[PDB]
């Protein structure tokens, strides 16, 4: 490759990192190594999670259900009683875990070699990654957007743009809902473990067997107009301060705008093309710009005056599309997190 693209590839294709990351989520790799991971294993996971969600919707069976889960998706809690899976946060953790294994299952297949390995990993992605000049117009806007939509309540770090690549995933230009109005350039963040999957298969909706209570606005692909909302889903740390952020063209269409969580939001569409969870603070439109016919919601964020008298109010917006054909990957940011 070019060196910058080589180091990116190195970075995301590091299986030792993937292993470290999974141990950090308390997954037992000694017992179920990542190289012995299969689609069937991971479905078995979902099927046992579904059975747990069932017990929370209904009311004993939960101990049977949690055990089956831990049998099929081994964990490592050491000498402590393995905890039960009982709260919304807990179940959503288990889903973040399984998603991640699916992306690793994918990476491990892909990183197998027959050319230099890094050049092989790269080719098998089927997605052009192109480093951009830091003096260029596109880098200017992206930096401004990165910083200017850093949310005031994600004050625990800053981000530094280390490097920028334009992304072009085979298939996407053509599949894309070019026709839909309301097209915006929006963020997506994810665990480092997941990039080989996302680059090679694209952003995907939730797995079919995934429990729906995990998903605030149902099983779509989620985006923010607030860089740090997305960046939080990188799960970076002082120990692992290099992450990646995605910018994608998102064909939003008419938005069904929602004040609070509804996992059945997808059936609420009834003609519309996306869900938008309304936030307290959002970038203001007097400040937007256009990059290749996609609106870029430049910061800073302002009180939108939005309020949910019924309960919890979102701090910042989110957008959910329920078909990959509404997403076109566009730029990938290499970001240093400064804690
Ligand atoms: C954890 N996860 N797995 C796939 N997608 C995600 C999240 C997400 N990933 N990345 C983003 O940029 C994002 C931007 C949002 F405004 C909102 C988001 C996300 N919510 C998604 C979410 C959060 C909790 C949950 F239980 C399920 C889904």
Numbering used by the authors: 234 to 292, 296 to 350, 355 to 579
In the authors' words:
The family of poly(ADP-ribose) polymerase (PARP) enzymes plays a critical role in the detection and repair of DNA damage. The PARP enzymes share a common catalytic domain, in which an ADP-ribose moiety from NAD+ is transferred onto acceptor nuclear proteins, such as histones and PARP itself. In both PARP1 and PARP2 the DNA-binding domain regulates enzymatic activity as a direct response to DNA damage. Here, we present the structures of the catalytic domain of human PARP1 and PARP2 (catPARP1 and catPARP2) in complex with BMN 673, the most potent PARP inhibitor reported to date.
A 62 kDa PARP2 enzyme, although structurally distinct, also has a DNA-binding domain and exhibits the highest degree of homology in the catalytic domain to that of PARP1. Extensive structural similarities of the catalytic domain of PARP2 to that of PARP1 were confirmed by the reported structures. The fluoro-substituent on the tricyclic core of BMN 673 packs against Ala464 and Lys469 located on the walls surrounding the pocket. The ordered active-site water molecules mediate hydrogen-bonding and stacking interactions with the bound BMN 673. Interestingly, the outer edges of the NAD+-binding pocket consist of the least conserved residues between catPARP2 and catPARP1. When bound to PARP2, a methyl group of the triazole moiety of BMN 673 points towards Gln332 on the N-terminal helical bundle; in PARP1, the same methyl group faces the highly mobile Glu763, which assumes various side-chain conformations among the noncrystallographic symmetry-related molecules. Also located on the N-terminal helical bundle, the PARP2-specific Ser328 is near the fluorophenyl substituent of BMN 673; in PARP1, the highly flexible Gln759 with multiple side-chain configurations occupies the corresponding position. Thus, the di-branched structure of BMN 673, extending to the least conserved outer active-site boundaries, potentially provides new opportunities for increasing inhibitor selectivity.
